[PDB]
Amino acid sequence: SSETFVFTKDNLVGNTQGSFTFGPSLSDCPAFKDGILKAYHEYKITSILLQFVSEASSTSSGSIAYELDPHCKVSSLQSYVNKFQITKGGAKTYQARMINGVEWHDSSEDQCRILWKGNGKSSDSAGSFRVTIKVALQNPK
Amino acid sequence: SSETFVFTKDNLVGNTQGSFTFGPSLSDCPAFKDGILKAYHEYKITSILLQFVSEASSTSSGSIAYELDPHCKVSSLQSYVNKFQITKGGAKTYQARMINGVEWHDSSEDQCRILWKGNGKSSDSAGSFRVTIKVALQNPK
Amino acid sequence: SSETFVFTKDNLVGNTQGSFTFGPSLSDCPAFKDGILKAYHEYKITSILLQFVSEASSTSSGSIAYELDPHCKVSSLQSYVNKFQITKGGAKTYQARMINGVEWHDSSEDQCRILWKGNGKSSDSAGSFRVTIKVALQNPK
Amino acid sequence: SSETFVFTKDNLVGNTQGSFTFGPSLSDCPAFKDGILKAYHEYKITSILLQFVSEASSTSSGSIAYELDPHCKVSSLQSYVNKFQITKGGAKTYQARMINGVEWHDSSEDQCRILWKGNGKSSDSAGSFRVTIKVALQNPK
Amino acid sequence: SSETFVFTKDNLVGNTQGSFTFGPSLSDCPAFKDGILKAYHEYKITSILLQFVSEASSTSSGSIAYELDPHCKVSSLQSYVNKFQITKGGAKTYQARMINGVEWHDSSEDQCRILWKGNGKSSDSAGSFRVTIKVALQNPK
Amino acid sequence: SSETFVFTKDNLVGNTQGSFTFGPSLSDCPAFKDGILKAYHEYKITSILLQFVSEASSTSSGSIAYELDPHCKVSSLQSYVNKFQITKGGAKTYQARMINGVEWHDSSEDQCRILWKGNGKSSDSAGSFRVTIKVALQNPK
Amino acid sequence: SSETFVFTKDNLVGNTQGSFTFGPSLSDCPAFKDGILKAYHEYKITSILLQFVSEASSTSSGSIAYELDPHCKVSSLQSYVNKFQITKGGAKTYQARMINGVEWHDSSEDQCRILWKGNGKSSDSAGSFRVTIKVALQNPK
Amino acid sequence: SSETFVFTKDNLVGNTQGSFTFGPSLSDCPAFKDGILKAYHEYKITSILLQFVSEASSTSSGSIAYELDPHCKVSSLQSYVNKFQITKGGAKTYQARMINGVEWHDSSEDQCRILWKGNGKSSDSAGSFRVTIKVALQNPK
Amino acid sequence: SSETFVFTKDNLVGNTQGSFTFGPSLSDCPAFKDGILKAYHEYKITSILLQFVSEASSTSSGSIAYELDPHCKVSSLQSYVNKFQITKGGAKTYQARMINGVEWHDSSEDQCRILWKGNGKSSDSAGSFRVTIKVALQNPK
Amino acid sequence: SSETFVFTKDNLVGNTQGSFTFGPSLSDCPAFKDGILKAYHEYKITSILLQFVSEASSTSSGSIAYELDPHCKVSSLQSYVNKFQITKGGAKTYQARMINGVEWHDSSEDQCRILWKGNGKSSDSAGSFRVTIKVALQNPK
């Protein structure tokens, strides 16, 4: 009973922060939060495609960094290894073994938490994060 | 992005009535009503397996009748051709061409409406209707 | 009797809105509106290639969002999942099964309605939307 | 549960008009109007063979025109492309894809409407239209 | 982007005259005149099937003559070589090399002009000329 | 006796206009205007590669539109279907059948006329149009 | 309906001039001028064999030059590239692609114009130009 | 970008002299002098076919001699090894290695200079020298 | 016992300088400096992928240059051959033979030193240098 | 004894000019000027890769043009056919036959001269021209 869910993030300022805690704590996708997840005992997210779609001016400087965090144990970013540019948007595709997606998780367990943090100005705009998850569910409820 | 949904109906009295209006009007499966259906533009239900699982006494007489109604245009049963027995439960599997399931339907359109009506006593119990739908969705939202 | 039609949209401001209701309600392509469509009973649009060709400055911030809406039932955008950037233009190709293009439609029936809505400034310019439709028609009139 | 129905039209004057609205509005075939159609939920007409069998004098001038109209949306002819001659009768065979006969229609939905209009005299006679439909029905009622 | 267009001529008297100047001067097919032709720079008509469908009495004498004229340079018939009979209708199929249909023509250039002239009575009727053109267009506008 | 000719257009302002009337009216390539063309009776241009090479600032907004016009009959643009962006330059390759390049043309006949028209500011600069034509000539003079 | 026509030019003086404008302006071949050409709408000349048959003395100096001119646009010679000798006569065979003989021409259109001009004395004699054309005609009139 | 050029020499007297300095100093072929050569940086002439086409009387005595001179360093003939006869004309074909045609030459460099000198009378006429060069050019300008 | 290490450089100003002295002198990767390197006698770095990930405005001019220096013997850049652009970031992958990575190095020996030096402004920002090294170690300690 | 040489050009202003006269007159590569060239009698440059590596702001307008000039005979540009953009840098690879690199040149002979000329502002910066030559030398000295 696999299903894909596409959800977006709103008009983002350049120094934005946040976290996509996947599972029953996605406030940004209610069709997965209290939609398909209330009708099954256990799930796992097979893949996560996180996409930064930037409507930003070409004179805006900065870069929005992100980390995967496969076990939901951090609340800030704390690691600036890989990052998107605010002018030129990007995309990152996470497979199953990266995102704790090989074992079945209970429907009250968060799976993984992608976090971001930008360093741009507090007046520019880079509203983005089209996110496409592929989730599989097996035990109906 | 296909997905199966299993939902049940509660403790049924012998002279029960009702309707399973599939689509955005299933009050009996919220994980399909305002779950996966709010995250896609259009859907179609590929198959419907309606199962009558009877916990009824062997001295209870009656038979619960049902009809398919592939276009949601009737509110009562009005046709007693095929039916389940209250003592011996049954099962009926509907494929795609029977249930208006060959074309994509908008996510505010009801697809088909299975109706039932029993003729048993108002004191017996035959709580049943394990229903398993296979639905496909394509245009994310 | 297949035929391709290319039509454009005019000088677009950055916060533009609108809708391309395909069929007999395209005000932007009269050669399909009251041209080839008045000489046939029924049609279907096999494919739609919507292209955003941006003549915009590299210091203009914003992003024009769009949705497909395969059944003409919405008048505003209401979904910001996928979008073009105003600086870097884009292209999106819709096949037949996405755009209600598998069954023949009567020549007074609108088929699908692509909508857009931008979030840029009301002074910038991103004049765009070269649209190429492939339509098939069979029953002459 | 396929079945063929042959019905005729009466003694036709040379300037005759009319329409064969197929489905539950055929007044000219009651064995399909309130016969086999009241015992099934949904139908589709697989083929329509319309035949003009003319008993007309060889000195009568005129030609009876006809159109298919696969979606019941016109009440007059309005298109004189193809036509029968009043002296020499004819025949026209419509397959499934022409007559909106690929999807199942509800038993209160008209499917297609063949219309005719002649230009002969109001005193001649060309009584005709042996019509043979092949209809399939699946969901009993 | 090839397309076929079928258009007819109205109730014809026996001594009828006229001309089918193909291209942007067909007054008898607006779906080709200001329909598909306004959306392309250049075209060519691949084939022309001219058909005389006669609803005429068998006591009406006469014959409607026609000529091809592949370059639009004559306004009357002036050549009675080939002709249809008013009682027994006919058909003539013109390929590409006959009708100046090997090179691309601009969308303000008439291609060829089929002319007819009958010698029957001014009271009889032979309403006819179902014409089917196959046109190809390449450069969108 | 095939030969390729590369010629450029000068320092272009953002709202530029013009036309490349190919043949004996190219004022921008004298080596083809009164060079190789005075020594042959007839020619044809096999291909035309029009390239927009932009030295423009990334804060300059606008887009230079162009059309092919295979028969030299228009003096303004009048069609804004396809276009280059002033910031990001482009390229368009026209084959033989598009540009009236299948038949031999006399050396006093213009073949085709590519036109452009921009909508940028009258102070910016996008000096461009490296054009490469492939021409064949056969009858010496 | 192909046909060959052989026509000659009269007693030529050594400094002769002229032109063979092929089509409806050949004054030197009336069997092609107002013979076979009045009975067809369109023609094309498949080949032209121009032969210089010299009855000239071996002490006469000079050379008669000629050019092809595939589009009837020049009235004098203006090009002395290839030429016959007045003493030793010659022959030149022109195929279809040289003489504008690949497309059908209307019967009031001149096709090509071979011109000659000699430089001999005004008292010598070289009477010549046996010309053999192969012409094809298709649309009768 | 290879191309062939055919140019002739005018009415020649029997004791004629001259030189064909190939490259940018051909006064006898302007379509190569300031035609195709102004649009390329560098060239080389692949072959030279020099042909003596004599319209001379059979009682005129003499012989026009010629030399190749692959490096443009002589202004008179100075070598009478090979020669044409004034009565019987001739032809000489020079390949690439003879005429300094293996390396690319700049477009302001003369390549080779064929010279001639006749010994006939100053009253006879042998107007001739149909010359056909095959030139290749590579670097556009 | 191969292992990959990804480390980044902080918020970089446009005129930044520095050096990545690989081995026991990486102050920017302590998990390789006094992590895995204290537990082995000898190592070698198999590959180095240096990536410039720019969050810089599109109106910032400059270019950050870099050199490899396979033997740690220079402290400034002194060579501006290859370089990244501050607006458009880049990537450079160094294999084993380039970076002195074919022989085993002692764990107190620096291997190679990549240096950079930019020429941008002292107010812009291009924070970058995601560096991924692949190191192999063999002799435990 | 082939060898590659990489040399750069310094901090370039937007309206820069110059020339790379290859051979013993490269002032920008002394390791080829009075390095390897003083130890051999004759050389030839097999290939030249000229690369424009731009550290320029995205609001700087202009384009730096260049020409090849395979024989060192021009001192200014004089031809604006192909060019780089100042914002988006580029690359051009010249093979052996383009750059006079098929014959051996003496070590006091310049081979070819690439010239450039920009049209940008006199205050912007686009410091660039990483040039990589492949040279072969055979006769030691």
Residue numbers in the entry:
A (entry chain A), B (entry chain B), C (entry chain A), D (entry chain C), E (entry chain B), F (entry chain A), ...: 68 to 208
Give sentences copied directly from the paper behind this entry:
We therefore present high-resolution structures for VLPs of BYDV and PLRV at 3.0-Å and 3.4-Å resolution, respectively. BYDV and PLRV CPs assembled into monodisperse, homogeneous particles of the anticipated diameter. When imaged in ice, both BYDV and PLRV VLPs were monodisperse, so cryo-EM datasets were collected for each (see STAR Methods). Structure refinement was carried out with icosahedral symmetry imposed, yielding density maps at a resolution of 3.0 Å for BYDV and 3.4 Å for PLRV. Density maps for each structure were of sufficient quality and resolution to allow for unambiguous building of the shell (S) domain of the CP (BYDV: residues 61–200∗; PLRV: residues 68–208). In both cases the N-terminal R (RNA-binding) domain is not resolved in the cryo-EM density, except in the “C” conformer of BYDV, where an additional six residues of the R domain (residues 55–60) are visible. We have also solved the structure of VLPs formed by an N-terminally His-tagged version of PLRV CP to 3.4-Å resolution, since the formation of His-tagged VLPs were previously reported (Lamb et al., 1996). No differences were found between the structures of the VLPs formed by tagged and untagged CPs. For instance, mutations in the CP of PLRV that affect aphid transmission can now be rationalized (Kaplan et al., 2007). The triple mutant D95E, P97A, K100S had no impact upon capsid formation, but decreased transmission efficiency, suggesting that this region of the CP may be important for transmission. Our structures show that D95, P97, and K100 are situated within α1 and the preceding loop, and all three side chains are surface exposed, where they could, for example, affect binding of the virus to receptor(s) in the aphid vector.
